Amino acid sequence: AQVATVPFRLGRPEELPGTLDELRAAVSARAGEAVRGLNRPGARTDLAALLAATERTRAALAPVGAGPVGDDPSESEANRDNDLAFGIVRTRGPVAELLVDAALAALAGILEVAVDRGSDLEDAAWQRFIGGFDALLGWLADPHSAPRPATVPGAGPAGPPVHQDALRRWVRGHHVFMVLAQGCALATACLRDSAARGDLPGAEASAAAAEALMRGCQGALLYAGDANREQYNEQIRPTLMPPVAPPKMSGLHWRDHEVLIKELAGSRDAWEWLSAQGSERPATFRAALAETYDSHIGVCGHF
């Protein structure tokens, strides 16, 4: 709808790989391809060359999209109406690899608005918001090491509020939601499985990934409220037409989020175990967890 790139191709989060080896054989090749693209020389000079590097990458990548899923018996109309409301199409194929395509796609959608009209988002929250991508692909490229954070160029100050440009950021921002939710649901499921299997180094890297993805979502919830407050201001105009309402998430029941909270649940015994084995991620994750829960206020409706 010219506000966002549609349809947004995405995998089925239930089919996400469940262990660290199944994730590596499935996605480490295409993710390492993406990491090479987003860190090829010159890409991090400013915000422009980063967006250009994003497009060269996903262009060069052989698309795996085996088309829309279609008839899904495990999808409810609560998931479908939630997927429709932001132009999401569940796509067949390598669900892990599709997540790399969705991560590259959603980032480019975010970098477009930031190149033309800057961002009044704070330069510290802007880092974790974009750093969540470096975390996802960096960890997807090597699921057995903690991703090392790369540099993220800054955004210019917010220029002129173009008509419904806060709606572009509102829809494009909710795509990053489903990208980071699937990614964070992975590292939690890997953390659960590695802890049960006695894989301490695997539990560490999985916890390091999930934390950087949690901090990435917190900056995403700020980016969302930045546009939802700019939306609330855009509607003081009395409108003789029926006031077109912004698309909202209907309750807790959108598919990727349903999966993430189920993974975070039941991962309780693994965090205490990491804390007992001398880790420092159980601490800084609980920080990122509560910072994300507080950041829902101003973004989610039933909240």
The reply to whether 88 sits in an annotated binding site is: no
Q: How far is the CB of 213 from ligand HEC (least distance, A)?
A: 8
Give the 3-state secondary structure of the chain: CCCCCCCEEECCHHHCCCCHHHHHHHHHHHHHHHHHHHCCCCCCCCHHHHHHHHHHHHHHCCCCCCCECCCCCCCCHHHHHHHHCCCEEEECCCHHHHHHHHHHHHHHHHHHHHHHCCCCCCCCHHHHHHHHHHHHHHHHHCCCCCCCCCCCCCCCCCCCCCCCHHHHHHHHHHHHHHHHHHHHHHHHHHHHHHHHCCCHHHHHHHHHHHHHHHHHHHHHHHHHHHHHHHHHHCCCCCCCCCCCCCCCCCCCCCHHHHHHHHHHCCCHHHHHHHHHCCCCHHHHHHHHHHHHHHHCCCCCCCC
| Nearest residue to 11 (alpha-carbon basis) of 182, 132, 187 | 182
Which one, 104 or 289, has the nearer CB to ligand HEC? 289
Q: In whole angstroms, how close is the CB of 249 to ligand HEC at the nearest point? A: 3
Determine if residue 296 is labeled as part of a ligand binding site.
Answer: yes
Quick one: 127 or 267, whose CB is closer to ligand HEC? 267
Report the nearest approach of ligand HEC to the CB of residue 212 (Å).
12
The terminus-to-terminus CA distance of the chain in angstroms comes to 28
CB of 207 to ligand HEC, least distance (A): 14
We find the least distance from the C-beta atom of residue 133 to ligand HEC, in angstroms, to be: 13
Binding residues vs ligand HEC (CB under 6 A) = 177, 180-181, 217, 220-221, 249, 251-252, 257, 261, 264-265, 289, 292-293, 296, 299-300, 302-303
Q: Which is nearer to ligand HEC, 57 or 295 (CB)?
A: 295
Toward ligand HEC, which CB reaches closer, 43 or 299? 299
Identity of the residue, 232 or 293, whose beta carbon is nearer to ligand HEC in the bound complex: 293
In whole angstroms, how close is the CB of 285 to ligand HEC at the nearest point? Answer: 10
Minimum CB distance to ligand HEC smaller for 90 or for 144: 90
Q: Is 130 annotated as belonging to a binding site?
A: no
Is 298 labeled as ligand-binding?
yes
Whether residue 297 is annotated as binding a ligand: the answer is yes
Binding site as annotated, residues = 296-300
Binding site as annotated, residues for heme = 296-300
